Structures are given as C-alpha cells and as structure tokens.
Design a protein around this nucleic acid. Structure first.
Lengths: 772, 276, 96, 99, 54, 103
RNA sequence: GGGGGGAUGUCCGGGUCGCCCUGGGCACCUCUCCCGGCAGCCUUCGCGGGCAGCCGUAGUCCCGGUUCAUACGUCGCCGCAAUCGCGAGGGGACCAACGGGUAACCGUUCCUCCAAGCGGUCGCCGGCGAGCACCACCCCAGCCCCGCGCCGCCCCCA
C-alpha cells in the first residue's frame, strides 16, 4: 500500500462565532422514563465567520457533524439562538416536543431564521436601525406569544415577533439616550426583565413590557490600558436571579439582582472576557477570555454569593469566542468554539475530573476527491475548486523530484456569490459537477482546457451530487431531501467529445412509517435529507441514505429506455440505529449478481448488505458488533471515509487509520464507565482526589474506600452456518484519503491539515499582558 | 494541645513517630503519660509521613503524608474520660506533594475547617469546607481551589489574620498576599533571599519572617517596613531538613554540599568585627 | 567557560561606619593570551601594600598612589583626592 | 548584552528574530567587532547568530552579503590582531636591551 | 453590481434592485465588522505573523 | 593557513559525525530530515532525536508523552512525502520507508 | 558503548554445489552481562546497605499538546560635578566586501577627520513648581483608521 502525505492543500479554517444548543436542560427522569425522553431531538448549532452554520448531534458523547449550511462571500454569522416550544400533549396524552426554530444574524440590520429541511434561509426581517449585534428570545413564565429581542449598534432595542412560522419586526422598545451607547451583550433575567451590557461601561436593566429603564448598572475605568470606557462583553443571569457579567478588564462582576448592583468583583483573566456560560441549576460558571483562557467558578461555601475561581486553563490555541452549556439525558457538557476553529467539549459536571475533548476542525464529509485514472486530486472551499496532478508513481521514486512531482494544476472560479456545497467528478476526470444550493454546474476538461457544460431544469440548487462510473448518470440531492437524476449523453465529433444533459428526472423516495407526533415534534421532517449517495461500480444500482438512517435504493431497468426503478427489496432494507456515516458498494463483484453494500453508522456499527436480497451478507451475519476489535470500538473518532481493496476495506476517521480483511472473521478506554459526555476518566493528574480512604482500627490496619458521588443460540446458529486488521494513530489531522492508480497494489492520497499559527488569525497584545 | 481531661484542661503532646521509613504513627501523651512513657496510639498511616499540627482545642488534628492528608476528628464530645480518645480518620490524595499546610478553624465550638496545602510544584491548593465534607460510605465531591503563583517551591502558606487573606512565602524571594475575595494578588516582592518561614501574629498586626539566610524580621501588616530585625551568621549550612524544593527532581538538583572554606577575615582596628 | 571567565580585582576603601566604597577595579589582573586565574592575595603587615599571584607566573605588587594625571589633583566634592592603587612592582617567578 | 549573558539568556533573546531584525543585529555586531573593549561580547553574540540563523541564507541573499560582510571585517581583524603582536614583540623586546 | 443612477441634474433615474439576496443570506456591513474588531483590539498591537520571511 | 583549514575541517568532521548519526536513525525509520545531495546544506544542522524528557516550570523534569512526541513528529514531517507501508508492517513486523521532499 | 551469541540481506576464492560456510565486507532484529540516569519498599538518627525494579527511545480513546513571572511609596522644570555617546553638515581614503560591467568602472556597504547642535548615567549636605486633576460631565473642531457615494486621470472595446 503506497501513501502520499499531502499537507500542501491550504484548507482555510475560520473563526467560530456562535454556539447554540437546542435545549439547555431537560427535566430529569429515572431510567424507567428513558423511553419518554428518548425521542427528544437534541442538536447543536455552530456558526463560522465564513457564514458557515453547521448542525451537530452530541450523540451521547458521539459528536457527529451532520449538516453544513454554507454562506456566501462577505457573509458571516454572529449570534445563534434555537427556539424550542414546550411539549404539546395530544388528545390521547401523547406528547409532541416543541418544533425547534433556529435564528441567526448576519452582522446586519437583518435577522434571518433558518429552515433546516430545505436547509437554507427560511426568512429575513429588518427593522430600520443600525447593525444588530446581540439577541435572544423571551423565556417562558405566553404559551404561544414569544418574542425576539435584539440589540443593535445605535442603541434601539428592537422587538421582533415570531408566531406561527413568522418573523417580523414588531416594534422598537426604546433607544438609549446618547448615540455612542453601543450594545454588545443581551440576556434575560426573568420573563419581563432584560439585561443588556453596553459600550459606555454600563449594564442596563430594562423592563420590556412597558419598555422602561429599571436600572442603570455601571462599571468604572479600565485602569490597566487606556481607553477609559470599559466594555461589558457578555452577560448572563443565574437561575436564582443574580447577574454575572464579563467585561473588558477581564473582571467578572457579581451583581445582586434584586437591587441590581454589585456584590463581588472577581479578577479572572488578563485580557478581556469573551463569553460566559452557566449550569442550569446555577452552580457552575465558565468564563472565556481572549487570552486563550478558560476559568471555572463555584461558590465560596458559606457566606452568600461570594463566588470563586476554582481554577483556569489554557484550552484552545486562539481565543474562546463563544461557549454554551447543556445538561441532560446523562450528559452535562459545555462547548467552547473559538477562533482556532476547534470546538472543544468540556465536561461541565466532571470538571477537573474528566478530560476535555477537541473535535476536529475539519468537516465530517471529507471534502477531497480524485480521479485515479487521471491521477487528479482536488478539493474545494468557498468558491474556488483546486486540482493538482501527481504525474508519477511512488516506486519510480523508490526525492529531489518530489517538488516537480506535485503540481498546482487548476483552480476554477464559480460565478455569482454562493458558496459551494459539494462536487462530483468522472473517474477519468473529464467531467465535473458543482452543487450550490442555488445552482449546479457541469464542466468538461481536456489535458488544460475547460468548458462550462450547461444544466437545464435546475435553478434551485443542491447539496450533494454524484457522477456515475460509466459517466452516464448524474444524481443530485437538491433541497436535501429531493434527489433528482439526469442522463448525460456523450457525443463524439472530429474535435472531440462533448456532453449533453437530459432533463433532470425526479425519482421518488419511499413513504416510510413514522408517527405524526414524531413528524411534528422536534425538528420535524429534518432527517430526510440524504447524507450520502453511492453508485454501483457498474452504475447499475444506486443508493441514498438520509440523516434518519433510512436507506433507499434503486435499480436500473434498461430498455433511451434506461430508467431507474425502485428496488422491491428496499422495503426489506431496514433503518439503522443511528446516522449512516458511510455507505458504498464494493467494487469487487459478487458471484450471484448481487451487490455488497458496506455500511458504517456513527455508533461504530459495521455491516454490509445484499440489497437485491434486501438482507445482510452472511459475513455480516457472522461478525457482530462486540466481535469488532477494541481499537476500532473505543476510538470516538467519527469514521470519515473508507477506501476499498480487493478483500480489504481500510477505514479512516479524522485521526486513526484502519484496515480489515473482510474475507476473514474476528475473535485504555474502559467500557463499564458511566461518564459525562467528553472523553474518558483521568488517571493521573487531577485536582480531585480519586482515592479516599477511611480507617477504623487506630493501628491503621483496617481501611475503607469512601466513594465519591453527589445471544447464545443466535451465535450458536451463526457459528453453525460456518485475523487481518490493523490500526494506527500516527497521522493525526487527516482531512481526506482517496485512492489512486497508475489484494491489489494501490497508491493513495493522504491529506492532512495541521493547524498553524500562520493559518489562524493573528494575536493581539498591548504592552501590559505579554505572554510567556 | 490544651484539652479538657475531666474538667481540667492541660497539655497533651502529639508526636508522629516512625515504625518504618515508609510509615509512622501518632501517639498522644499527658504529662503523667509521659512520666510513665506510655502513650495513646491514635493513627498509624503509611506514606512517608511528613507532618502533624492541631486545631483549636483539640477537636481535630492533621498529618501530612506525601500525596495525602490525614485528618482527625475526635469521636466523642466533651472528653469525659481520658481513655475515649479515638479519632475517625479519613485520608485523601492531594494532587501534588505536600510541601506544607496551614489550618483555619470555623467557629464555643468548631463548626468547620478550611485547610490550605502548598506544594513544591509551584502551587497552593486550599480546601474549603472540610468538617461537613467529611463528617457524613459516600460523600459529595470535593475540589480544592488552585492558587498558582510560584515556579519553585512554596515554603510556607498561612491563613491570615481574619481569614480574608492567604499569605505565602517562597524561594523566588517574594511574599504574596492572595486576596481571596477577588481574584487579585498583592505582594511584597524583594527579599534578600528565600522566604523560608512565616507566622501570623496573635492579632493580625504582625508577620514574622524567618528569612532562609538565617535571619528574622517582624513586619507590621500593610506598612511593610520591618519593625524588627535579627540576623545570623549567614554562612553555608549542612541543613538538617534536606530541602523544600528538592522533592521533585529539579533540573539542577539541590544537594546540601560544601565545596570551599567560608571566605572570611577579622578586622584590625576593630577586633569585634569579622567580614565574611 | 574556562576561556570566558571574568576575573575582577576590586580595591575597596573602608568606611569606619562599616561601609565599603570602591576605589579601583582591575579587569585583567593577570594576563597571558587568556585571562589568568588568580591564585591568591596577601597584605603587607607593615604598609598599605597588597600582593597577587596568578596563573601567568607573575606576582604583582599593588600600592596606593594618587589619581593625578598632569599635576592637578582630582578630588571628591569635599576636596579629598581620589586615591587609586596600582601595580607598583612586577616579578616573574622561577619555574623548574 | 553583558547582562543578558550574565544571566544566561542570550539564546532566548536571540531565537525570536525575523529576517530584517537579523540583518540589523548582524550589521551592528559587524560594526563593533573591532573595538577590543567589548570584542568578547560581540563575537559571542555573533556565534549565536550563526548558530541560529544560518539556514535560510540560501533563501535570502541580502543577509548573505551581511554574512559575508561580517566575515569580511573579521578577515581584516585577525591581521590587526597579528600586526599588533608583530610589533607586540618589538616593544617588549626593546625592554630587555635597556638594562 | 447595481447600475448607478442617471441624473438629469434636477431629478435622478435609477433602477430598483433586490436581485442580490435571493434565498442565501444577507451580506455583512464590512464597516460594522471592522468596528467590532476595533472594539476587540482597542489599542493593542499584533505580534509578528510567522517567521523568517520577506 | 593551517589554522584556517583546521577550523574548516573540524566543522566538517563534527557535521559528518552528526550526519552519520542522523542517517542511521533515518534508516531506522525515526523519520527526521536528512540531506540527500552531494553538496553541503548551508545550515549544518542535524535535527536531533527528541529527548524523552521535558523541562516544565519551574525547574522540574518529567517524561515526555508518547502523544506529545507524536506531535513533534507531525511537526517534523515536511510538506510532501511518500510513506510506503509494507506487508510486514501490516503483519506488525517491519517499519516504513519514507521519502520527504528536500526542504 | 563494549564483550559476545541466535537470525535477516549482500559481493569477491568458492564448494559435490547446497543446507550455507569459512576468509574479507558487513547493516539490522533478538539474547546476554558491565554504562548512565531514574524511581519505590525494608534497613539504619544519619551515613550507608538490601530487595525486586524500570528507561536510554519514538506517532496517542480523549488527554499534562496543560500549570507557571516580582509591589507600592510623587510628578515636572532647570542647574552643577564627574563620565560617555550620537551627529546635521562639511571633508578624505579609496582598504575591503557585495551587485552589475571582461575590464575600464559604477553603485551600495565599510573605514576615517573636523564639526553646528544634541542626548544618556552616577553623585549632588543642587534648587524651583505643583501633587483627585493627564480625572467626572457636555459641546465643538482635528489626526490615524475604516465604510459608502461623487469626480479627476487612465482603460479598453466604440
């Protein structure tokens, strides 16, 4: 197996600015009502300064990146708030969880709410003012009258109305007196009582209902640097009503909230606070400061409200721009996303007691592709699609010539201002396709000369796209859920080959069986958007797989009488336990004419289908999930891609690397542990005492360890019907691995993205707070 | 310790005596128990035992193991008889080697304690609500606050005065006053040598500094001119306690060694004066 | 490091309040192709004279004269002259 | 500089330099290698420079000049070092004729 | 971009335009963003970006 | 002139020694950067192997992690290379053969 | 590192010619004990001693890929006494080195004389003014920066 280590791709990381959990806490239940709290869809949104918003599942410590909505050039995001209704109870006592709406901004005078099914901008709304900087929705105390409150540059609190799928500027509450009073932070003390933190060192407590100014809190001069007027950067309110406010001298103020004044001034960071977060019972305060620092707060026991800075840490590489809490269903975390593009999850209730976890900054979809016949490697971001050629083998080089071995071949631009979702290529690379959520464009290429092959029928734009191996069929995922296909016809002439696309022919997915309270509650029909699309090696059977784990397959009925029919065994093909993170045909043909469909879901669930039979392969009948090797089973790396060999399937997440000889069968991170959702327990260096021993028998001999707390016949038949696997961690930040040609020998492109201080945005220091 | 035997308080002595190198045991004594040379064995613990001290009255004691703390609550109330001196002892690992510690009581009773450990790692952990963390099988989470200044070994952490302030003296020649109600730290930075030992006066008014180069100065608090000075011969010493900072295998390792005669002379025209 | 050593000789006047005041530093009191590590020093019990022996092989005799460049006398503000010591005599030593 | 050698830190002070800075430090050290009142410190810091930045001189020719110009002055400094001791013997050796 | 206005000098003739923000997202005010970055780095200065480079 | 050449050759010799060391570990597979061509790189620097120990604050020493070691290895990987894996490595027997670009 | 072995791949005499070997070249894995450091436990007041010890090299579930830095006490003007420097500008030497041009030579750096003026340091039994306030508040202009409209020029096609 030959490997090319490729760093030279400059995939741009961007600053996370916003982090929004759907819910923050759920009311606790016992294990007997786990089935009650089971179907509550819990998602986590994160927004990036290239206007990227993305939807993640925490997935019980799983952290699967599911959906990416790209935003165009000179478009970004700053604030993010989910809007979750309380649960509706049906006429039979059945429950309907809240339809969750998701709202963001664009550094503008413009709010926009995001539809998640069609996976683009549902709505916009704009009251006339300066630029909206901070916003949140009124909490519950009416039941259906809930409203946005947005603070902006010039001052005027605007009040926006969201009732029954609406988003409209209701009115202006008030504006501040002066013109230099800029608003930066907003949070709600109670139902009617809003708190804004604002530019001239002030914290205004307004009553919203009348719209009056209940009290003006005030802060003093920043006596470290100049620029007198301190800037409250972030405010929240504790669940028992006091107010906490991170500022520009890095202090953290404890305002008694009954009379709206101070009781404590804690010095936390060196540079300025950037975000606060709180436990939902009101017991853990997390401070995040521009000196790439996170600090952690618990009350000084005893006298009232004297909080304390238990400890701090330097977590990220660049500073922590936003962080948000969540606590429930056996999971108690807080996510800090910063400018170094790396969301880190922290264990809220296990802090100092459990290791944090860095997610990959890279998209879960691998975003790299290649034509091995053409030996053309490529990737894409915002609008530029870049292609390199390798021109050469490896064994030829088996040094001085590697510089010319790699080659910046092409970099193509896209008209308009959309950002590119996905792209598909022919195996010889002559044919290219680009999927924006407004348009899809085809490109013919010649060893170079390009031409823009034109698409008809579309104009609404797509998230996924796949070119058939025979280069006859083009299938896209448009509006996420609506997969369409067209034939492409290759017409040869004396100048060469050209290509014409037919009308896009819509094919229809299957009406599954889902309860209507499930269809209404949560996010709604969100999961329907197809995650992945896989052609057969002969392009004779296509399959799709959505976020719900439903898989839908189609066969090709030839006679142009070629037309794709629904596979009748698609009814037999069942829906998974979790999200199908990879799905591909084996290129190796069967002996019965069936295909073999490799499937992995994010719970490290490995399997393979005989789709024409609508049932599993017999090797999959043999090998079960616990039969998997533990290096596969305990990695917590969401497995990013497979590559194929003859009898082997190599797997790569972000970090690790695997291979499996699928012909054969099979014979540290503890498994019995019950944790909060980030990583595995500390073994050496923690501030908590891990062993505490009591002693009776004053001669010391007797001790006590005081604890710390607040298919037998199936495998019989599976063996009555009757290794080579390998793993490593030694390639850490892999964005993408794609095979290339020139148990068979194969070359491959490994492509990594180490994070460099050259890549991240620059640091900033004054004379005072110079680091070490 | 002063403690009531029947209605008569007196001084019990509390020693920590080894039985191996790796372990020791604390034995308490009356005057007359000393006279008969027999003592009450209270707790034998078993990690290279460093220290013991004792709280107001005799309600509790503390002993210092390498990674760990041994805290002793007396069992009964009021100490009716001399023989019912039994202490329910619990132990627990401090995250770093215990260089020193100092207690503070929470009050005719003792309602809780908060005890501060200081470690050669360069850290100062404080423990906040001990008696009710430990009096009640299962107990809740505990977590020291971590206060980190020095790079070298903290020689001595003491609770202050009120109990508002935490003062500290280290190798790096600088006495820190941790604010402990805010986050801040205000400090007397330039001493002639390592701050080796401090104690807080009866009232909060004076500090005593045993400066590691064999001297002592008494300060008043917040005026910081030394109202009192006493120095010694300042020479090179084969020191009995080996070190405070040589516990964790520092890059240059401290060895108590002497490599040269101590260069010195006597003065003609003033024979009372020696230069060294 | 043996090459880059610094060896200073520092001449001090005694303040009878037990104070020390400089009169003269010498930067290379025993020189050969490198600065020579100095072995020892001694005091003439009769007169103000100091004595040095070092790694070069030479013994140097130092004596206090007066800083006086061309007859005028350089004085501290009270008028007291800036006395300065100097290598009065130089002797090489027989080696066998 | 002599303090930043007294405390051993001259390494750490030097290592965080860029191209233009390196050039300026180089031209300075070249400017003052001559005066034997401080040639010790001049040559030591030049040693650290060569040790710490001699890798990218193939990338940047302008410092290579100053690198050469550093060499160039020193080339004329051993001669002054010798030409002294050439006459260095002469002045000492008259002193043995006078007796 | 948008066509600029043609004034007769007395009046103005321009073309309406909203074909820019179709269903994607609104474009930001570059001014407002730089304002935010100013308020972040009020006075303070950047360190050298990377390393040994022209 | 003898002094001149004593200098230049003592340089060359010590460089050659560290270079022999470096090529020994590179053949071993410790995946540092060694020079290929018949000409001296200007900076005679032989990128040393990582000491298994580290100097924390304040002056203390502990063991490096395997993990931080792998971090520094990631640092020392160049821009582009080939990393041929053998069947014996896949068997868990042998080690890799790597060729990095001449940096 | 050494001393050694077992095994990998290799040429030159080679051998019935094959297992490879001896003679020369060897590089590796594995075993061995002596080198260097580490840690525990028993021992003894200590010194020492014993015990079974790891590591000297590479890539991880996550993850120490962390933790960590020295006060206030009062600011400004000018002066002296010692002590050291920069130089505007005017000049020389053309030594060197670099980049061009064969070279002629140019250009840059380097060296150096004199100098208008100018700084810094230690000590002053120098003086001389004020010590929130270089701040609170509002207004008005201004610089730096950044956002957009308008021109000016220049484009090209026309």
């Amino acid at each position: 197996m030959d490997i090319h280590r490729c760093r030279f791709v400059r995939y741009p990381a961007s600053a996370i600015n916003a982090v929004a959990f759907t819910h923050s806490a759920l009311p606790v239940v016992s294990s007997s009502k786990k089935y009650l709290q089971k179907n509550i869809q819990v998602r986590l949104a994160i927004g990036r300064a290239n206007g990227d918003i993305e939807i993640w599942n925490p997935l019980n410590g799983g952290w699967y990146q599911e959906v990416i909505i790209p935003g165009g050039k000179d478009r970004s995001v700053d604030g993010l708030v989910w809007v979750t209704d309380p649960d509706e109870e049906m006429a039979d006592g059945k429950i309907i969880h809240g339809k969750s709406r998701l709202f963001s901004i664009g550094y503008t005078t413009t709010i926009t709410e995001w539809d998640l099914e069609k996976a683009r901008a549902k709505k916009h709304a704009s009251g006339q003012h300066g630029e909206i900087w901070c916003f949140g929705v009124q909490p519950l105390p009416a039941a259906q009258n809930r409203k946005l409150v947005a603070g902006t540059v010039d001052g005027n609190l605007v009040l926006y109305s969201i009732e029954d799928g609406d988003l409209k500027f209701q009115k202006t509450l008030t504006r501040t007196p002066s013109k230099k009073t800029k608003f930066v932070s907003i949070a709600f003390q109670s139902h009617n009582i809003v708190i804004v933190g604002c530019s001239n060192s002030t914290i205004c407590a307004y009553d919203v209902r009348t719209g009056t100014m209940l009290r003006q809190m005030t802060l003093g001069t920043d006596l470290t640097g100049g620029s007198k007027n301190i800037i409250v950067w972030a405010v929240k309110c504790l669940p028992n009503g006091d107010i906490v406010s991170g500022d520009s001298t890095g202090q953290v103020c404890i305002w008694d909230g009954k009379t709206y004044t101070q009781a404590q001034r804690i010095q936390s960071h060196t540079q300025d606070v950037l975000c606060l977060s709180v436990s939902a019972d009101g017991s853990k305060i997390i401070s995040g400061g521009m000196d790439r620092r996170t600090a952690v707060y618990e009350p000084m026991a005893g006298q009232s409200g004297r909080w304390s800075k238990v400890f701090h840490r330097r977590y990220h590489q660049h500073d922590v721009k936003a962080m948000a809490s969540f606590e429930g269903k056996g999971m108690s975390v807080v996510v800090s996303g910063g400018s170094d593009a790396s969301p880190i999850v922290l264990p809220l209730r296990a802090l100092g007691k459990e290791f944090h976890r860095t997610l990959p900054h890279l998209p879960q979809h691998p975003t790299v592709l290649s034509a091995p016949k053409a030996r053309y490697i490529l990737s894409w971001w915002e609008n530029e699609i870049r292609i390199w050629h390798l021109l050469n083998s490896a064994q030829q080089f088996l040094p001085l010539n590697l510089r010319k071995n790699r080659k910046f071949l092409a970099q193509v631009l896209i008209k308009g201002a959309s950002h590119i979702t996905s792209a598909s290529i022919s195996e010889d690379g002559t044919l290219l396709a680009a999927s924006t959520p407004t348009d899809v464009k085809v490109f013919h290429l010649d060893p170079l000369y390009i031409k823009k092959v034109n698409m008809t029928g579309t104009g609404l734009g797509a998230t996924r796209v796949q070119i058939s191996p025979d280069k006859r069929w083009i299938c896209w995922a448009e509006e996420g859920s609506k997969v369409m296909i067209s034939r492409v016809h290759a017409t040869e002439s004396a100048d060469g080959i050209s290509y014409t696309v037919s009308v896009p022919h819509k094919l229809h997915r299957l009406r599954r069986q889902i309860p209507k309270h499930i269809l209404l509650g949560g996010l709604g029909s969100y999961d329907r958007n197809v995650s992945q699309i896989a052609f057969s090696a002969d392009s004779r059977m296509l399959s799709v797989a959505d976020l719900a784990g439903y898989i839908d397959t189609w066969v090709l009925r030839g006679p142009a009488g070629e037309r794709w029919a629904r596979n009748p065994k698609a009814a037999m093909i069942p829906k998974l336990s979790a999200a199908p993170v990879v799905l591909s045909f084996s290129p190796t043909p069967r002996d019965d004419g069936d295909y073999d469909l490799l499937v992995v879901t994010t719970l490290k669930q490995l399997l393979i289908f005989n789709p024409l039979r609508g049932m599993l392969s017999e090797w999959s009948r043999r090998n079960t999930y616990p039969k998997l090797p533990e290096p596969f089973r305990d990695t917590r790396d969401q497995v990013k891609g497979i590559v194929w060999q003859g009898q082997r399937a190599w797997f790569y997440g972000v970090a690790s690397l695997f291979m499996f000889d699928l012909s054969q069968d099979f014979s540290k991170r503890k498994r019995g542990a019950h944790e909060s959702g980030a990583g595995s327990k500390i073994e050496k260096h923690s501030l908590v005492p891990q062993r505490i021993r009591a002693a009776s028998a004053p001669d010391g001999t007797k001790w006590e360890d005081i604890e710390m707390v607040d298919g037998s016949e199936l495998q019989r038949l599976r063996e009555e019907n009757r290794a080579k696997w390998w793993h490593t961690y030694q390639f850490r930040p892999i964005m993408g691995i794609v095979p290339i040609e020139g148990i068979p020998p194969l070359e491959v492109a490994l492509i990594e993205r180490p994070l460099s201080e050259d890549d991240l945005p620059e640091r900033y220091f004054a004379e005072g707070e110079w680091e070490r | 310790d002063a403690i009531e035997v029947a209605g008569k308080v007196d001084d019990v002595l509390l020693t920590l005596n080894r039985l191996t190198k790796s372990s020791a045991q604390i034995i308490a004594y009356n005057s007359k128990m000393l006279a008969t040379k027999t003592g009450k064995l209270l707790h034998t613990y078993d990690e290279s035992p460093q220290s013991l001290r004792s709280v107001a009255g005799g309600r509790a004691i503390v002993a210092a193991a390498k990674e760990a703390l041994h805290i002793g609550i007396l069992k009964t109330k009021k100490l009716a008889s001399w023989e019912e001196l039994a202490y329910r002892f619990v132990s627990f690992d401090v995250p770093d080697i215990i260089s020193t510690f100092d207690i503070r009581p929470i009050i005719a009773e003792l309602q809780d304690i908060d005890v501060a450990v200081g470690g050669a790692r360069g850290a100062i952990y404080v423990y906040s609500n001990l008696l009710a963390h430990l009096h009640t099988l299962r107990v809740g989470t505990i977590q020291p606050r971590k206060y980190h200044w020095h790079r070298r070994a903290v020689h001595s952490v003491k609770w202050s005065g009120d109990g508002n302030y935490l003062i500290s003296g280290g190798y790096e020649t600088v006495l820190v006053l941790w604010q402990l109600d805010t986050g801040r730290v205000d400090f007397l930075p330039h001493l002639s040598a390592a701050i080796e030992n401090i104690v807080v006066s009866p009232k909060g008014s004076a500090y005593a500094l045993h400066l590691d180069d064999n001297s002592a100065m008494v300060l008043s608090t917040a005026e910081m001119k030394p109202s009192m000075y006493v120095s010694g011969i300042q020479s090179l010493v084969l020191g009995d306690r080996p070190s405070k900072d040589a516990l964790v295998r520092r890059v240059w390792r401290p060895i108590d060694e002497i490599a040269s005669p101590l260069v010195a002379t006597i003065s003609p025209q003033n024979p009372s004066h020696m230069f060294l | 490091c043996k090459e880059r050593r610094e060896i200073y000789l520092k001449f001090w006047e005694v303040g009878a309040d037990q104070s020390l005041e400089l009169v003269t530093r010498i930067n290379d009191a025993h020189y050969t192709k490198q600065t020579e590590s100095i072995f020892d020093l001694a005091s003439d019990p009769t007169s103000a004279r100091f004595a040095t022996i070092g790694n070069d092989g030479m013994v140097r005799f130092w004596s206090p004269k007066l800083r006086k460049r061309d007859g005028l006398m350089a004085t501290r503000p009270d008028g007291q002259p800036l006395r300065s010591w100097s290598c009065s005599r130089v002797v090489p030593l027989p080696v066998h | 500089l002599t303090a930043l050698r007294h405390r051993s830190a001259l390494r750490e002070a030097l290592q965080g330099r860029d191209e233009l800075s390196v050039i300026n430090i180089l031209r300075w050290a070249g400017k003052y290698v001559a005066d034997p009142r401080y040639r010790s410190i001049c040559v030591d810091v030049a040693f650290h420079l060569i040790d710490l930045y001699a890798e990218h001189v193939g990338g940047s020719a302008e410092l290579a000049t100053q690198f050469q110009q550093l060499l160039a002055k020193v080339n004329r400094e051993v001669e002054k070092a010798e030409l002294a001791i050439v006459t260095g013997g002469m002045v000492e050796s008259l002193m043995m004729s006078v007796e | 971009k948008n066509p600029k206005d043609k004034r007769v000098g007395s009046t103005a003739y321009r073309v309406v335009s909203n074909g820019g923000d179709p269903r994607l997202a609104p474009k930001a005010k570059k001014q407002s963003l730089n304002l935010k970055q100013a308020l972040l780095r009020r006075d303070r200065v950047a360190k050298p970006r990377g390393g040994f480079f022209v | 002139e003898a002094v001149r050449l004593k200098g230049v050759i003592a340089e060359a010799a010590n460089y050659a020694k560290r270079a022999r060391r470096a090529l020994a570990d590179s053949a071993k597979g410790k995946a540092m950067t060694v020079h290929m061509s018949a000409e001296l790189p200007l900076g005679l620097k032989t990128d040393n192997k990582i000491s298994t120990e580290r100097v924390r604050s304040g002056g203390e020493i502990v063991a490096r992690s395997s993990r931080q070691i792998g971090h520094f290895i990631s640092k020392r990987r160049g821009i582009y290379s080939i990393h041929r894996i053998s069947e014996e490595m896949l068997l868990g027997a042998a080690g890799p053969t790597v060729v990095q670009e001449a940096r």
